[PDB]
Symmetry: C2
Subunit: 199 residues, 2 copies
């Protein structure tokens, strides 16, 4: 009844809050089944590995291998993903990311083209990330649980392209899912990530 | 052309309740067909790829062309690996080889299931003949043991699209129902052709 030590943070919005772009049924399975289960399994390992209980998700991402890495990475990836969406989100970015997007991709339209193409093209399960590398914006793909924190890097935005993220709502139409993700982006969260990094 | 998506070996609801008509429609009419289409589009621009068999591309190709050719084969194999009136205990040569190489069908079932439930991300679990020996091997993403000149006998798709409509996140329920569908005739045919 006291389970831990890792926890699955609650969604920052109610289940129907992202409709029609992402369904309540999707949020329920994706968060309450997939996300929560990754945390449960990690905890199972933590119970028998005091080294893995002593480490932050980020330290496990940087330092672990195999299943423990995959689990910690996935727990972080989903928390970041769900934080990265919002009921009053979407549309063109404002504030500092808007400036940096212009700086590094020329325009939001071009950034949107690049990021969508990466997300639509990723073969198999994975993630697409907007990262700040050494103060510079870059789009990187993470196959399976791949997370750029393992390298030097700072995540700013992501999209989950594992099939479970969209199959209930879009079946195999990943491109339609990616299109709809732009209506959901939480630019306030993205801008907080910018602010926290030096950039 | 040059590549084609073979029709399903049975009508869309033939596998219910284990696998739904809706799953067969999406998996075959959408995923499988689209792999073929995309490979065909690459073939129109790539005379080398257009010159090759699917198995030649699986053995020697790279990048996107490999992934597509392998997925075309993998899905044809998989849909052939299922049958209405399949399932149950194997008979014939495969039954003998499984007892030989795993001790019992039950032990093989355990091993194969654990591999399929265990596979992280998108992939395939194969039963293979390797110099006449049965082995279980995992193919991540489009991985196919023909690339290592091994002979495929059985497979299961553990890409989420294979089960999500019918089982959502419950992959282990999908894997258990798969045993009710296995087309042992197809598996024995593969055994016969391999000469093992
Ligand atoms: Fe996910
Ligand atoms: Fe498939």
């Amino acid at each position: 009844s006291v389970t831990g030590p890792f926890q699955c943070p609650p969604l920052p919005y109610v289940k129907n809050a992202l409709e029609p772009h992402m369904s309540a049924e999707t949020l329920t399975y994706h968060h309450d089944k997939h996300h929560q289960t990754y945390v449960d399994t990690l905890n199972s390992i933590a119970a028998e590995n005091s080294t893995i209980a002593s480490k932050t998700l980020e330290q496990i991402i940087k330092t672990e291998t195999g299943k423990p890495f995959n689990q910690a990475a996935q727990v972080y990836n989903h928390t970041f993903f769900f934080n990265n969406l919002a009921p009053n989100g979407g549309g063109e970015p404002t504030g500092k990311i808007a400036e940096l997007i212009t700086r590094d991709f020329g325009s939001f339209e071009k950034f949107k083209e690049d990021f969508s193409a990466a997300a639509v093209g990723h073969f198999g399960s994975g993630w697409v990330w907007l990262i700040a590398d050494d103060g510079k914006l870059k789009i990187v793909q993470g196959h399976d649980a791949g997370n750029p924190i393992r390298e030097s890097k700072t995540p700013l935005m992501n999209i989950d392209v594992w099939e479970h993220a969209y199959y209930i709502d879009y079946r195999n139409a990943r491109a339609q899912y990616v299109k709809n993700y732009w209506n959901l982006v939480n630019w306030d969260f993205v801008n907080d990530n910018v602010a926290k990094a030096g950039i």
